[PDB]
């Protein structure tokens, strides 16, 4: 029982952790796509 106390992660805790990690990752990927939408306003200015 004491060894179980020391070891044996709580599935509730790591389930919540991975869920929020996955959402943060997807948010980061979407924001990365928005930021990698690099300025083409420079291209727009170029022909002006």
Binding flag, residue 33, a second copy (CB under 8 A): no
- Residue 19's nearest CA partner among 9, 8, 11 is 11
How is residue 37 annotated by DSSP? S
> How many Å apart are CA 7 and CA 4, to the nearest integer?
5
Stretch that binds a second copy, among 10-18, 20-28, 29-37 (CB under 8 A): 10-18
Binding flag, residue 15, a second copy (CB under 8 A): yes
Binding flag, residue 11, a second copy (CB under 8 A): yes
Residues of this chain that bind a second copy (CB under 8 A):
11-12, 15, 19, 42, 45-46, 48
């Amino acid at each position: 029982e004491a060894q179980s106390r020391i070891q044996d992660a709580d599935y509730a805790t790591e389930v919540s952790n991975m869920s929020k990690a996955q959402i943060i990752q997807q948010a980061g990927n979407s924001v990365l796509a928005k930021a990698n939408q690099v300025p083409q306003q420079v291209l727009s200015l170029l022909q002006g």
